[PDB]
Amino acid sequence: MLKYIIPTMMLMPLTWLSKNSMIWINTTLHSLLISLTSLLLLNQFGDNSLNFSLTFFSDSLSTPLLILTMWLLPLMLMASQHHLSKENLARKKLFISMLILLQLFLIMTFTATELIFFYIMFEATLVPTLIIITRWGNQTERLNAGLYFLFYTLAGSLPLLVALIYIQNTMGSLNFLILQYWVQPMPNSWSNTFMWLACMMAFMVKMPLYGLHLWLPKAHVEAPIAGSMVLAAILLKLGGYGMMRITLLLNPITDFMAYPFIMLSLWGMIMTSSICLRQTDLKSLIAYSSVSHMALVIVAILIQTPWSYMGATALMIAHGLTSSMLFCLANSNYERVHSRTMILARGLQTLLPLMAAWWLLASLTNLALPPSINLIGELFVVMSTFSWSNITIILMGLNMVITALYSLYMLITTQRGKHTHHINNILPSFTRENALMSLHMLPLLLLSLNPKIILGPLY
Amino acid sequence: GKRLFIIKPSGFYDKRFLKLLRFYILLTGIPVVIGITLINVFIGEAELAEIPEGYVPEHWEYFKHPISRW
Amino acid sequence: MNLFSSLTLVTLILLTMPIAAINFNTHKFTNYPLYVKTTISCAFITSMIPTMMFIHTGQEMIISNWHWLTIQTLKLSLSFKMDFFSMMFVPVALFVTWSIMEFSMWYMHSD
Amino acid sequence: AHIEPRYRQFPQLTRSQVIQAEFFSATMWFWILWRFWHDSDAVLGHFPYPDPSQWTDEELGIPPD
Amino acid sequence: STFVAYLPDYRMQEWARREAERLVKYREAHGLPLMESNCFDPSKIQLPED
Amino acid sequence: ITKDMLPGPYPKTPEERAAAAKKYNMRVEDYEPYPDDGMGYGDYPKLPDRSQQERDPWYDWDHPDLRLNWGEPMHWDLDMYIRNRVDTSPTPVNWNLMCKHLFGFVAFMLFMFWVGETYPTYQPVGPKQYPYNNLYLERGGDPNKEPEPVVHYEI
Amino acid sequence: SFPKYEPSRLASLPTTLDPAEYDISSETRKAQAERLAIRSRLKREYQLQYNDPSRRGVVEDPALIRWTCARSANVYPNFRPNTKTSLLGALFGIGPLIFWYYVFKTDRDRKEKLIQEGKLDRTFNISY
Amino acid sequence: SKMELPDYKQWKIEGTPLETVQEKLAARGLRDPWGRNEAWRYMGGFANNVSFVGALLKGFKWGFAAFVVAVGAEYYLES
Amino acid sequence: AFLPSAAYLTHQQKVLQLYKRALRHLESRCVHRDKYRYFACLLRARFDEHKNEKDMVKATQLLREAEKEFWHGQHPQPYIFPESPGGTSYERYECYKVPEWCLDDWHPSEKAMYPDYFAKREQWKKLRRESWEREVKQLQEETPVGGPRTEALPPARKQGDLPPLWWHIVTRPRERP
Amino acid sequence: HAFFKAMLFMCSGSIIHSLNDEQDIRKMGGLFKAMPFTTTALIIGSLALTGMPFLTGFYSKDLIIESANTSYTNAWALLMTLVATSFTAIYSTRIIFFALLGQPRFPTLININENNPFLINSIKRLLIGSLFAGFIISNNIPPMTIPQMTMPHYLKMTALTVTIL
Amino acid sequence: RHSIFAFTHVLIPVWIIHYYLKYHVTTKPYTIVEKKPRIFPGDTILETGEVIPPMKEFPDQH
Amino acid sequence: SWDKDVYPEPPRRTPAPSPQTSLPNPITYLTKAFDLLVDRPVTLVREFIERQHAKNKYYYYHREFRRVPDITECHEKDVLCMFEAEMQWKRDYKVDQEIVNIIQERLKACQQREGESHRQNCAKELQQFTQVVKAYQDRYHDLGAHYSARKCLAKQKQRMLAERKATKEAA
Amino acid sequence: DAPPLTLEGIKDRVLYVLKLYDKIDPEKLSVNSHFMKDLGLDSLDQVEIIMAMEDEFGFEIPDIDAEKLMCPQEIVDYIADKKDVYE
Amino acid sequence: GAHLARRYLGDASVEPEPLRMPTFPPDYGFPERKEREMVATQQEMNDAQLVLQQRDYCAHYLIRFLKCKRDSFPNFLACKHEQHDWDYCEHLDYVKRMKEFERERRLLQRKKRREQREADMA
Ligand SMILES: *C(=O)CCCCCCCCCCCCC
Mark whether M42 is an active-site residue: yes
Question: Nearest-CA neighbor of A207 among A269, A255, A137?
Answer: A269
Q: Hey, what amino acid is at K51? A: V
Strands J109-110 and D6-7: antiparallel
Q: Hey, what amino acid is at A96? A: I
Phi-psi region of H51 (alpha: psi -120 to 50; beta: other; left: phi over 0): beta
- The Cα L30–Cα C2 span in angstroms is 12
The answer to whether residues L119 and F140 touch, using CB atoms and an 8 Å cutoff, is yes
Kindly list the residues from chain A whose CB atom is less than 8 angstroms away from the CB atom of residue I99: 419, 421, 424
The answer to whether residues C4 and C53 touch, using CB atoms and an 8 Å cutoff, is yes
- The Cα A45–Cα G26 span in angstroms is 88
**Any chain B CB within 8 A of the CB of C26?**
yes
3-state secondary structure of K58: coil
From the centroid of its chain, how far is CA B69?
Answer: 18
- The Cα F142–Cα G1 span in angstroms is 77
Nearest residue of E to residue A458, measured between CA atoms? E11
Q: Positive or negative, the Cα torsion across C108, C111, D4, D5?
A: positive
Kindly list the residues from chain G whose CB atom is less than 8 angstroms away from the CB atom of residue C74: 127
Q: Hey, what amino acid is at K59? A: P
CA of D16 vs chain J CAs: smallest distance (Å): 8
Dihedral pair phi/psi, residue C81, rounded to 5°:
-110, 110
Q: How far is CA I45 from CA A93, A151, I19, I48, I65, in A?
A: 86, 81, 12, 5, 17
**Any chain L CB within 8 A of the CB of B45?**
yes
CA dihedral defined by A317, A322, A325, A330, rounded to 10 degrees?
-140
Q: Tally Cβ neighbours within 10 Å of residue A80.
A: 23
- The Cα A105–Cα A97 span in angstroms is 12
Q: Hey, what amino acid is at H38? A: E
Instruction: Mark yes or no for CB contact H37/M17 under 8 Å.
Output: yes
Dihedral pair phi/psi, residue A50, rounded to 5°:
-80, 105
The answer for N 40-99 residues in CB contact with L (under 8 A) is 46-47, 49-52, 68, 71-75, 78
Which residue in I165, I170, I171, I172 has the most chain G C-beta atoms within 10 A of its own C-beta, making it the best mutation to test that interface? Answer: I165
The kind and range of the H/E element at B47 are: strand B47-48
From the centroid of its chain, how far is CA C12?
Answer: 3
Q: Residues with Cβ < 8 Å from E26, sequence gap 6 or more? A: E32
The answer to whether residues A250 and A186 touch, using CB atoms and an 8 Å cutoff, is yes
**Any chain H CB within 8 A of the CB of I37?**
yes
Strand partners, A152: none
Dihedral pair phi/psi, residue F63, rounded to 5°:
-115, 95
3-state secondary structure of A341: strand
b/e per residue C17-34 (b: at least 16 CB within 10 A): ebeeeeeeeeeeeeeebe
**Any chain C CB within 8 A of the CB of K4?**
no
From the centroid of its chain, how far is CA N62?
Answer: 17
Rounded to the nearest angstrom, the distance between the alpha carbon of D41 and the centre of ligand 1 is 21
Instruction: Mark yes or no for CB contact C55/N70 under 8 Å.
Output: no
The answer for F 16-75 residues in CB contact with A (under 8 A) is 62-66, 70
How many beta-carbon pairs below 8 A join chains H and I? 25
- The Cα D63–Cα D55 span in angstroms is 15
The answer to whether residues A235 and A294 touch, using CB atoms and an 8 Å cutoff, is no
| Atom of ligand 1 minimally distant from the CA of N2 | 1
- The Cα J154–Cα J145 span in angstroms is 24
Q: Tally Cβ neighbours within 10 Å of residue N31.
A: 6
N residues, chain F: 155
Kindly list the residues from chain E whose CB atom is less than 8 angstroms away from the CB atom of residue L162: none
The answer to whether residues M82 and J134 touch, using CB atoms and an 8 Å cutoff, is no
Q: How far is CA L72 from CA E41, E42, E45, L96, in A?
A: 9, 10, 7, 20
Gap between the terminal Cα atoms of chain A: 23
- The Cα A52–Cα A421 span in angstroms is 61
The answer for M 46-85 residues in CB contact with H (under 8 A) is 52
- The Cα C71–Cα F4 span in angstroms is 62
Instruction: Mark yes or no for CB contact D61/N28 under 8 Å.
Output: yes
CA of L81 vs chain G CAs: smallest distance (Å): 30
Strands C61-69 and C76-82: antiparallel
Return the domain boundaries, chain M.
Answer: 1-87
Q: Residues with Cβ < 8 Å from L27, sequence gap 6 or more? A: C52, C53, C56
| J117-140 helix and D15-38 helix, angle to the nearest 10 degrees | 10
- The Cα A184–Cα A192 span in angstroms is 12
Kindly list the residues from chain C whose CB atom is less than 8 angstroms away from the CB atom of residue N71: none
**Any chain B CB within 8 A of the CB of E6?**
yes
Nearest residue of G to residue I11, measured between CA atoms? G22
Q: Which amino acids bring their CB within 6 angstroms of ligand 1? A: F 121; J 69, 78, 155, 158; N 1-2, 4
Question: Nearest-CA neighbor of H63 among A303, I130, L156, D29?
Answer: D29
How is I38-81 classified by DSSP, letter by letter?
HHHHHHHHHHHHTSS---HHHHHHHHHHHHHHHHHT--SS----
- The Cα M35–Cα M53 span in angstroms is 15
Which residue in H14, H20, H25, H43 has the most chain I C-beta atoms within 10 A of its own C-beta, making it the best mutation to test that interface? Answer: H25
The answer to whether residues J78 and F121 touch, using CB atoms and an 8 Å cutoff, is yes
How is chain C classified by DSSP, letter by letter?
-HHHHHHHHHHHHHHHHHHHHHHT--S--SSHHHHHHHHHHHHHHHHHHHHHHHHHT---EEEEEEEEE--TT--EEEEEEE-HHHHHHHHHHHHHHHHHHHHHHHHGGG-
Q: Hey, what amino acid is at J12? A: S
The answer to whether residues K59 and N39 touch, using CB atoms and an 8 Å cutoff, is yes
- The Cα K35–Cα C4 span in angstroms is 13
Q: What is the DSSP letter of C80?
A: E
b/e per residue A234-264 (b: at least 16 CB within 10 A): bbbbbbbbbbbbbbbbbbebbeebbeebbbb
Phi-psi region of M84 (alpha: psi -120 to 50; beta: other; left: phi over 0): left
**CB-facing half-sphere around the CA of N28: CA atoms within 13 A:** 19
Kindly list the residues from chain L whose CB atom is less than 8 angstroms away from the CB atom of residue K30: 7, 105-106, 108-109
Nearest residue of K to residue N61, measured between CA atoms? K58
Q: Whose CA is nearest to atom 1 of ligand 1?
A: N1
- The Cα F17–Cα K33 span in angstroms is 81
Instruction: Mark yes or no for CB contact I45/H34 under 8 Å.
Output: no
| A89-109 helix and A2-16 helix, angle to the nearest 10 degrees | 180
- The Cα K41–Cα K54 span in angstroms is 5
Question: Nearest-CA neighbor of L4 among E28, E40, D14?
Answer: E28
3-state secondary structure of K28: coil
Q: Tally Cβ neighbours within 10 Å of residue C57.
A: 18
The answer for N 3-62 residues in CB contact with J (under 8 A) is 18, 51, 53-54, 56, 62
- The Cα N108–Cα N24 span in angstroms is 9
The kind and range of the H/E element at A50 are: strand A50-51
Q: Whose CA is nearest to atom 10 of ligand 1?
A: J79
**Any chain A CB within 8 A of the CB of B62?**
no
Q: Hey, what amino acid is at I78? A: P
Q: Tally Cβ neighbours within 10 Å of residue E8.
A: 17
Q: Residues with Cβ < 8 Å from C53, sequence gap 6 or more? A: C3, C4, C59, L27, L30
Q: Whose CA is nearest to atom 2 of ligand 1?
A: N1
- The Cα D55–Cα D53 span in angstroms is 6
Q: Tally Cβ neighbours within 10 Å of residue A361.
A: 19
Cis peptide before A208 (omega within 30 of 0): yes
Which of J72, J155, J158 gets mutated to test ligand 1 (max ligand atoms within 8 A of its CB)? J155
I and D: touch, per 3+ CB pairs < 8 A? Answer: no
Cis peptide before F9 (omega within 30 of 0): no
CA of M19 vs chain J CAs: smallest distance (Å): 15
Cis peptide before I76 (omega within 30 of 0): no
The kind and range of the H/E element at G125 are: none
Nearest residue of E to residue A456, measured between CA atoms? E11
b/e per residue C67-103 (b: at least 16 CB within 10 A): ebebbbbebeeebeebeeeebeebbbebbbbbbbbbb
3-state secondary structure of A208: coil
**CB-facing half-sphere around the CA of J30: CA atoms within 13 A:** 27
The answer to whether residues D65 and N114 touch, using CB atoms and an 8 Å cutoff, is yes
Instruction: Mark yes or no for CB contact N75/L23 under 8 Å.
Output: yes
3-state secondary structure of K34: strand
Question: Nearest-CA neighbor of N102 among F123, G32, G99?
Answer: F123
- The Cα H75–Cα I30 span in angstroms is 55
Where would I find the beta strands (DSSP E) of M1-87?
none
- The Cα N43–Cα N63 span in angstroms is 12
Which residue in the list M12, M25, M42, M65 is annotated as catalytic? M42
Instruction: Mark yes or no for CB contact J17/M3 under 8 Å.
Output: no
3-state secondary structure of J76: helix
- The Cα A48–Cα A58 span in angstroms is 10
Q: Whose CA is nearest to atom 6 of ligand 1?
A: N1
Kindly list the residues from chain G whose CB atom is less than 8 angstroms away from the CB atom of residue L142: 128
Phi-psi region of A127 (alpha: psi -120 to 50; beta: other; left: phi over 0): alpha
Nearest residue of E to residue A60, measured between CA atoms? E11
